Amino acid sequence: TSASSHLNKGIKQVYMSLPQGEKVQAMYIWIDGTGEGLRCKTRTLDSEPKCVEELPEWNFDGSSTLQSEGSNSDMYLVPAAMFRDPFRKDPNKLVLCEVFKYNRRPAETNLRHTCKRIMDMVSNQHPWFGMEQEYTLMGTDGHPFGWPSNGFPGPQGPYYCGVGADRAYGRDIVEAHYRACLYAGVKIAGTNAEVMPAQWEFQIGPCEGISMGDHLWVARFILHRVCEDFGVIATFDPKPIPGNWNGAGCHTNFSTKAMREENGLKYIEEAIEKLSKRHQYHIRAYDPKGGLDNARRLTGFHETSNINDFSAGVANRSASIRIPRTVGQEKKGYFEDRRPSANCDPFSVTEALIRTCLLNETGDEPFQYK
Amino acid sequence: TSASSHLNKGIKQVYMSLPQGEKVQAMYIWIDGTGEGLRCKTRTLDSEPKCVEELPEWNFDGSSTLQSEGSNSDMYLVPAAMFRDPFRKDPNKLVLCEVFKYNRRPAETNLRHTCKRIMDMVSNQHPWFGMEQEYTLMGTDGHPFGWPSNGFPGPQGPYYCGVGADRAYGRDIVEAHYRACLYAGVKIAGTNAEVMPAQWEFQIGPCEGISMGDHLWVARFILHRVCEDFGVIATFDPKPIPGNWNGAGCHTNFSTKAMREENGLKYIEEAIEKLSKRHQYHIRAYDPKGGLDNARRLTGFHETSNINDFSAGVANRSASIRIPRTVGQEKKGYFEDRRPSANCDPFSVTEALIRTCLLNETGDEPFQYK
Amino acid sequence: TSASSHLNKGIKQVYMSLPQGEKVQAMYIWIDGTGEGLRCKTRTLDSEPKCVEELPEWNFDGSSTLQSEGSNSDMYLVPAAMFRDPFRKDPNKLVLCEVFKYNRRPAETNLRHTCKRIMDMVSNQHPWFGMEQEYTLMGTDGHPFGWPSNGFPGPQGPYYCGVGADRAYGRDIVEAHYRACLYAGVKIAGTNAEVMPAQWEFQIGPCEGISMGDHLWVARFILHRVCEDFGVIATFDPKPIPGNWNGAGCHTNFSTKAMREENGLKYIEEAIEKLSKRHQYHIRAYDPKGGLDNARRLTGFHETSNINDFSAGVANRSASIRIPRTVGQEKKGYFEDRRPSANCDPFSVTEALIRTCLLNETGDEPFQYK
Amino acid sequence: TSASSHLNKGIKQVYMSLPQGEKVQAMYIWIDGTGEGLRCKTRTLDSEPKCVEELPEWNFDGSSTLQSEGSNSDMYLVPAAMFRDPFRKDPNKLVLCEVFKYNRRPAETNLRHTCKRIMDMVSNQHPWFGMEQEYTLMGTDGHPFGWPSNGFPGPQGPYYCGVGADRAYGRDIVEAHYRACLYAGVKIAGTNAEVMPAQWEFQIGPCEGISMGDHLWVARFILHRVCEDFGVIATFDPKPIPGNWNGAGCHTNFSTKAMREENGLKYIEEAIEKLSKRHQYHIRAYDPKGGLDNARRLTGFHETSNINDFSAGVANRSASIRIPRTVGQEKKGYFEDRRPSANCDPFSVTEALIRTCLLNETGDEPFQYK
Amino acid sequence: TSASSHLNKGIKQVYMSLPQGEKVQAMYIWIDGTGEGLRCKTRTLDSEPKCVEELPEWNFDGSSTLQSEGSNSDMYLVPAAMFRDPFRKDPNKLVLCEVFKYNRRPAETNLRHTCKRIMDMVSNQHPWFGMEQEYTLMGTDGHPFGWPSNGFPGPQGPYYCGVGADRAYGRDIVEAHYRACLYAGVKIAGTNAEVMPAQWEFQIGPCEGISMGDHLWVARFILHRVCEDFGVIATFDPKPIPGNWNGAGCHTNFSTKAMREENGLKYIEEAIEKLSKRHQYHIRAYDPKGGLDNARRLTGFHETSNINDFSAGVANRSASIRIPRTVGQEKKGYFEDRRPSANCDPFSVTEALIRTCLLNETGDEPFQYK
Ligand SMILES: [Mn+2]
Ligand SMILES: [Mn+2]
Ligand SMILES: [Mn+2]
Ligand SMILES: [Mn+2]
Ligand SMILES: [Mn+2]
Predict the structure, then answer these.
(1) Gap between the Cα atoms of C189 and C207, Å rounded
(2) Is the Cβ of E191 closer than 8 Å to some Cβ of chain D?
(3) Where are the beta strands (DSSP E) in B90-156?
(4) Ligand nearest to C-alpha B203
(5) Which residues of A touch B303 (CB under 8 A)?
(6) Judging by beta carbons within 10 Å of its beta carbon (0-12, 13-18, 19+), is residue C114 exposed, middle or buried?
(7) Is B150's Cβ below 8 Å from some Cβ in D?
(8) Are chains B and C touching, using the cut-off of 8 Å on CB pairs and a minimum of 3 such pairs?
(9) Angle, CA of A155, A156 and A157, to the nearest 5°
(10) Where are the annotated segments for Required for glutamine-induced ubiquitination by CRL4(CRBN) and proteasomal degradation (chains A, B, C, D, E)?
(11) What are the sequence ranges of the domains in chain A?
């Protein structure tokens, strides 16, 4: 649908075929001032970097990305995680970088820095996270891909986990994204079509601590890039189409070594009790705009929790926190926080799960730790 | 967008697959009478040339390229640099050739010849150059690629270092160009999307002396050829679209062994003082038309230096010469001359940096040396 | 949408402008063997016919219209009613003709002949009828006009009696049909958009006895012809689109001089009691296929009576027979039989209302009268 | 852009040419349950109605228009005003009808009934009203007409009161609407292009009392119908396009005989003082959703009053109430309330101006009068 | 080419057919802050205005037209001239209005006010003016109408005064404009195709004094409006296409009663001598930007005077001022000033011809008169 997609791709492929030689390419990817966005730039490295630590720091213009004022626009990218590059193949890498200010203080959307400190405090207990990112592939026009033009597809029902031309739209984009994630090392755990047509879900898990955020952000970047080649645009909006068509939510699974260990459902239920008390804090933490975006998806209908009221159940698809029945039967496992929106920053959601359940924080403001 | 792009490219590829045998192809590339343009022609060589010196001299009709009068139209190409050919692969080569007149005097746009002499005088001090060529991919119609037809894209902001179908236009062309440069041996140091949509930057660094000009010219040639296959046209105009959309400028980094060496920021600042004094000379040297073109980009707005007034700062994105903060902290490094336009001849810009800073020249006219 | 519609209509108009002279054209229109269809043919008459009686009888091939076997295929058209011709203007006429068999016995779909006898028996009591024919304009593809392609329009709601490009589809066809009916002398009483998009209703009445059938059939013919010029196709199917989108039903209003006269609601309610007893007979009489077609529309949902169960109420939109509240308040008026399908033959519906309510018939078979 | 627009219009015109005869058509137009919408249906009248009183009452299904529950869905249309029909010409009429419930109580969106009572109380003082309705013509896709596809038109500036193909979009629709209003008798006082491209304003006035609302509603209906024929859709949304492009607001001019009479600016300023006190009441009254819609347009930028703060000035384009300088110089005249949104119900805005300024009401609830 | 042009025009025509009744429409047209532009708005007048004096003054927002600051944005339109309306026919009028500031001082682009005073001083001598406005019809894309796409038409030569599909482009627009001017009362004196393809010339003559400016401005407005209906855009740029294709210039003929009277060529030549002395003043007065625009057209090639050097000849097409040979033979007549650009404000050009030749002014600044 995009002009770029229309460009002959065979041509680009023959250039990709050419041996690149000793020089290696690293894409430096960083979160935007908006906080939902991702930006990227490429540098040439003389030799393949064995580890993320080896990769050099780089700088970018903050004013263009809306992360700083003109007077000291420069911002610094510090490599945080390194993944293989699906797009260019090995030795090329994709680097996720924390953004730092001109004065070397973590940037406003560098939520990894605070989250990383929080994960380190609770590293002994091995908190693990899984997330279930939901997205709709929408053409350049902004209307979902494959929907009739100036129209709506047939009644909702056949599209969930659908097969066939009519049932599923953008499977190729999904297939490419999934393989690209495997090649990159992003821990994709599976994919499924979603109830809304043209809407899919990709789940990353089980990552441990800060890794969850890194993997999801890289997965999202991979999705956007794969989508760009096809010409479609992935959207993480909580309610992509207004109406009865389903909204997109990123349901975070959370477990700790104690919960996973036998008779750990006591821990699962203790965590849930803490979550209920800080529900306002969680809703704000879980989406970039503080809950306006999350509220659109969370209408209390279409199997979504109401955003006003916290709820917990076992095998209750709708309630804000659902313990799977199997986890309950096993008396050990994980619970699924279903409040986070699709546009949620993973670092915030993980950090808030740790802060509320493991660090036992109380009150609206996040704690400051020595 | 071009008719040629519409031709089936698979067909051409099957011919490229055919083994070419012992014979080797050399593209002889030379600068136009206009001085911004590049022209090219191909010859068959019995065996692969090991070195540029081996390559034979060739001649071309100057009247067609607007480099000489009809009476003695013939001009001579002398191979100057040799690169591997990305388009046809090895053993084929791309040759950049100095243009000489019928009377064997360097041609008017053979600025390499004078520059090479200047580089040789200062070879002991190892001046190194980096440049940051900016360009906009524009369709055959002349309107930037991917912009709405008879329209303008959404407000400036999301496109800088952007990812996704909406944010970036012509990434495939950029990817192909970058790989082609690596294969050719052009020293590409990285690439980034630019603030304007459909505008990108490719940086060649760090080359030493005359090499900088050769690499950039070959890089530009590679870009034009890659663009031709896709059907888009790269433009190096200083202000490709008139209005608030950003102009394209080639910011030249300059260093010398002394500046690079510890406590070399004294040298960096001495060079800057000299640059300020010859600002008129630099502006004229830095663009083909003497500053009319450069002035359009350099309005003193959109983070560009005013073309009337020289300015210098540390980490001052806008000022004509910016020392990176990191270079200042290290007390050694390079400074970034930001006055040169995208259409600048690299040989002129390098030569003028040497002449002003290293040779300590004074006055409007360039010096004549024994 | 049809190829014929694409033909330049200005050209046809200049021929229509030409004076036709003394000769007059009469379109002879007759019901098909199927009974839902209408067919037509044109003859030239030396002078304008003042009355229907003057018009000459004509014959047609029954085998082509599926009304008789090959051995005695000829069938005879006897002019029954005459209307002015909207399409060609005066003096040209549209003639509705009863179809008679080769042996001069009324044809199987010549339901007017039996109905006319029934109306004549009850002529003293002046039964009047009103009908509300509903139809959907559907392109040559068979999908309703203006609906997205391979898609469905927005949720039902805004389209009923709608104004604006989005709300109403085929208003021009409706406007032309309405004016054509006025010119022809069809007693069109009004028009409204219907709940389903692209679906409209036209009301004919108040008519008297056999006239109701004649007017409706001519109105339908006019609609089909007007639609043909636009290229759309009108459909009288009971359930044009399968699903929650509304079906098309022709609700017959019925009154008699006694009911209309003050304190005539006793008569209205006596008629309704008789209607309830012969509900099976009515359902069969009211549609061509005996109730299979009617059943699709009459699901007992979307404000339609269930086809299995008779119901009567006052101002009960859904019940099979509704007395308007105003009629009830006035203690005189008409009741609305809502069981007849859009594809109903009017002659059958009127005849069955007379037979059940006025002639007080009992039993499945229609009575035979001396 | 709509499928209906693509249908040949010449054909419809030849049917319109046919003489319609004695029978006359009346379009009964009524406000929707939403309150922004308008719906319409047509009936045939034996003779032209000389006055609105002559026109018969009619009924419609409230459930389809979302004005009543299914049990007593019927609602009643009582003719309120009569206008000539531009679409079908004389003798045909357009009728604006108040909507009444099944129990004969004014419907929820029958705001004319309460307003009419209020106007009658103040009839002695002759309040006159003038409203500037603003609207954007937007294609079936929902993007404004003539804007580049998936794009934005050139910077705002040239389009206000513009001439030429580039400057003005949908002038034909505007021209047709204006003439149609004149023919109908709607008191159009002028038209101008608006700052946003594809956005126009049609001003109605000076009408007196209840007439103001009737004329505006009929004008809006005429606009929607004219737009439907062209295929475009008029929108009265307060902020049709989100961003710096201008929103659409219906600025109202209020005067009374006293204000108009010499040295009446004291009255103009007394009214303004009262308006300031009931600003919350006015904002709620002035738009259907209570101020959410109005707030989007009223950002306090682009020459619009902030919706949070009341402001008054003389010749202050931006302030909520502006007295024209000429009115101030004359010491007599009208003031312009600029708070009402484009989607405002006129009956509400007029009624609230009377209630606050003339009836001197105090408090959130509207008064109940014997 | 414009979307608006694609809208069915037959529909608009049927609305135009409707009788408009007693009310009359007046388009108030005024010059933009840029000074090349024209803007327009419509008002309803109860009765046809017999004279321009009768027409009411109106006001508009200066900030939108870039004529004043926000604090006192209001500007006032005072009707100056009245013409019949070709677009809506009689009684509707087109009004050209002088623009006045909030403080009632003539606006910056209200050059008529100063010019009118100058004409009045010399009214006794009856200066007459003729002008020859040249324009190119260019599609919405900005490339001249009928030129090949991304291409150039055949060599210049056949297009001047051409006939046939290949030779002339936009004759229909020209024909409509010419008739519209006749109907309006604009004094069109003729039309011819121009050397460049798609370029035409319309000449308004001979008007006296201030009338010349009024007629030309109204003619230009009529052209823009006629062009808008067709979808093309007229351009008055001095050099519409860069290259050898001809530029558009408005050659002003000037005469006075004395020059016209026998043996008046002495006066014609005295005026020319004065013109030569104030050549700098004339070049600045003759175009909006002070000569940058005029210089592009006036290259001293393609039969245009060089803008640097004044020249005068008899029957010398190229020289800045040409006396026609016939005028010279007659020893009486007019001379043709060929320096003014197509985008010239007529009021400025006339005023400067009067000031230099008739008022015998000397020096760069225009004189101030009691
Ligand atoms: Mn799940
Ligand atoms: Mn930089
Ligand atoms: Mn009904
Ligand atoms: Mn205003
Ligand atoms: Mn001439």
Answers:
(1) 10
(2) no
(3) 93-100, 128-138
(4) 2
(5) 61, 63, 70
(6) middle
(7) yes
(8) no
(9) 115
(10) 1-23
(11) 1-108, 109-370
Give how far C150 is from chain A: nearest CA, Å: 7
Per-residue tokens: E147: 């030129």
Rounded Cα distance, D289 and D294, in Å: 8
The method recorded for this entry reads cryo-EM
Resolution (A): 2.7
The dihedral region occupied by C138, where left means phi > 0, alpha psi between -120 and 50, and beta the remainder, is beta
Q: Which residues between 84 and 113 in chain D have a beta carbon less than 8 angstroms from any beta carbon of chain C?
A: 87-88, 102
Q: What is the 3-state secondary structure (H, E, C) of chain E?
A: CCHHHHCCHHHHHHHHHCCCCCCEEEEEEEECCCCCCEEEEEEEECCCCCCCCCCCCEEEECCCCCCCCHHHCEEEEEEEEEEECCCCCCCCEEEEEEEECCCCCECCCCHHHHHHHHHHHCHHHCCEEEEEEEEEEECCCCCECCCCCCCCCCCCCCCCCCCCCCCCCCHHHHHHHHHHHHHHCCCEEEEEECCCCCEEEEEEEEEECHHHHHHHHHHHHHHHHHHHHHCCEEECCCCCCCCCCCCCECCEEEECHHHHCCCCHHHHHHHHHHHHHCHHHHHHHHCCCCCHHHHHHCECCCCCCECCCCCEEECCCCCCEEECHHHHHHCCCCEEECCCECCCCHHHHHHHHHHHHHCCCCCCCCCCCC
Which residue of B5, B141, B232, B233 is the best one to mutate when testing the E interface, meaning the one whose CB has the most E CBs within 10 A? B141
- Name the amino acid, one letter, at C226: V
Contacts of A222 in chain B (CB under 8 A): none
Give me A10's structure tokens: 């065979």
CA distance D88 to D16: 7
Structure tokens at B337: 């001359």
Best residue in B141, B182, B195, B244 to probe A by mutation, most A CBs within 10 Å? B182
Chain E nearest-CA distance from B151, in A, is 9
**Of residues D140, D142, D150, nearest to A140 (C-beta):** D150
Residues of D within 8 A of E21 (CB-CB) are 182-183
Spell out the long-range contacts of B222-228 with Cβ–Cβ below 8 A and sequence spacing 24 or more.
B222/B86, B222/B94, B222/B177, B222/B180, B222/B181, B222/B184, B222/B186, B223/B135, B223/B177, B224/B38, B225/B87, B226/A15, B226/B173, B226/B176, B226/B177, B226/B180, B227/B137, B227/B173, B227/B177, B228/B2, B228/B4
CB C350 within 8 A of CB C334: no
- Closest listed residue to residue C12, CA positions, set C88, C85, C83, C105: C88
B317 annotated to bind ligand: yes
Let me know if chains B and A touch, i.e. at least 3 Cβ pairs under 8 angstroms: yes
* B153 contacts chain A (CB < 8 A): no
D179 with E72: Cβ contact below 8 A = no
Q: How far is the CA of D16 from the centre of ligand 3 (A)?
A: 28
Q: Does A140 touch chain D (CB under 8 A)?
A: yes
* Record: contact C173-D7, CB cut-off 8 A: yes
